Amino acid sequence: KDTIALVVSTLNNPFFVSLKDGAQKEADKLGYNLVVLDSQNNPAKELANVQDLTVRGVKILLINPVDSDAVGNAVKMANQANIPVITLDRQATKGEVVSHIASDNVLGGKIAGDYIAKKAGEGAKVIELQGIAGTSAARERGEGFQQAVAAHKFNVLASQPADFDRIKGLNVMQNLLTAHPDVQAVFAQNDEMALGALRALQTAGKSDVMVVGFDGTPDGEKAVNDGKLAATIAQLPDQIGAKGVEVADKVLKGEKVQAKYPVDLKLVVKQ
Numbered sequence: 001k002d003t004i005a006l007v008v009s010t011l012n013n014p015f016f017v018s019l020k021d022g023a024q025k026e027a028d029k030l031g032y033n034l035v036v037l038d039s040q041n042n043p044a045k046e047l048a049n050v051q052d053l054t055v056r057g058v059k060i061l062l063i064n065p066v067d068s069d070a071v072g073n074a075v076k077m078a079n080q081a082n083i084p085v086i087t088l089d090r091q092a093t094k095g096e097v098v099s100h101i102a103s104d105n106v107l108g109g110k111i112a113g114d115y116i117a118k119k120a121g122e123g124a125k126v127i128e129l130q131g132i133a134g135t136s137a138a139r140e141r142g143e144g145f146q147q148a149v150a151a152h153k154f155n156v157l158a159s160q161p162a163d164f165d166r167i168k169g170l171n172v173m174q175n176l177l178t179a180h181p182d183v184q185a186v187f188a189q190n191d192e193m194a195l196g197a198l199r200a201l202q203t204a205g206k207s208d209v210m211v212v213g214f215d216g217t218p219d220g221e222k223a224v225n226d227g228k229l230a231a232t233i234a235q236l237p238d239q240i241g242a243k244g245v246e247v248a249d250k251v252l253k254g255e256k257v258q259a260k261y262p263v264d265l266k267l268v269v270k271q
């Protein structure tokens with residue numbers, strides 16, 4: 001079997017476990033060996049892993065950067081080895097990349113803000129919990145949300161990163177609530193942060209504050225159905241993973257591959 005490598009930012013997040021599962025299923029179907037290396041949200045690890053894979057002479061690198069700015073040197077190493085690179089979910093700011101497969105995260109952030117305007121109103125007092133700085137996902141969601149802040153004249157009380165992490169989201173939101181008890185709505189750039197924020201708000205007696213997440217993870221979907229999470233923006237991580245392999249196969253066969261394969265997003269609310 002030929003080997004495709006998948007270098008994933010972390011497997012401590014259900015979104016990325018699903019991404020890996022889609023890649024694996026597709027690899028199995030197309031007859032490739034898939035080597036999955038977990039970067040553990042660590043730029044040093046990501047670099048070591050890519051170096052290892054380039055010396056193993058993998059045929060294609062699928063990479064979900066830890067940091068879109070920091071991954072340039074890892075990608076240049078694959079470039080020097082003539083191993084084509086396909087980015088999944090997050091972009092590489094520098095380096096040669098054959099194809100990028102991700103959600104329209106600008107649109108996602110706009111959709112999230114637009115729903116907050118629908119339910120909390122024009123001029124709502126909002127807090128944004130940002131993802132990992134340096135990731136195109138967080139940057140784009142922030143851009144999309146700012147479009148909503150402008151459109152609907154939101155009062156942004158605070159916008160701070162909680163690193164796509166549930167516990168950080170809890171600690172950051174707890175902290176922000178003390179400064180800004182008048183918050184009316186929160187946009188958390190993933191469901192893990194959203195669920196942390198929800199826990200901080202319940203603790204402070206502010207469970208009336210509307211929260212919108214991102215990803216539509218099983219825990220996000222459950223939280224919507226339970227009435228705790230106002231909404232989430234559903235992504236299709238299995239499809240991002242699968243497409244990565246499908247395009248890797250294409251590249252290897254010399255077929256023409258798009259520079260970008262956008263993957264659909266969907267506002268999810270309780271039915």
Ligand SMILES: O[C@@H]1[C@H](O)[C@H](O)CO[C@H]1O
Binds near residue numbers: 015089135138
């Ligand atoms: O798209 C992904 C998901 O939102 C994940 O939960 C965090 O990283 C982003 O890049």
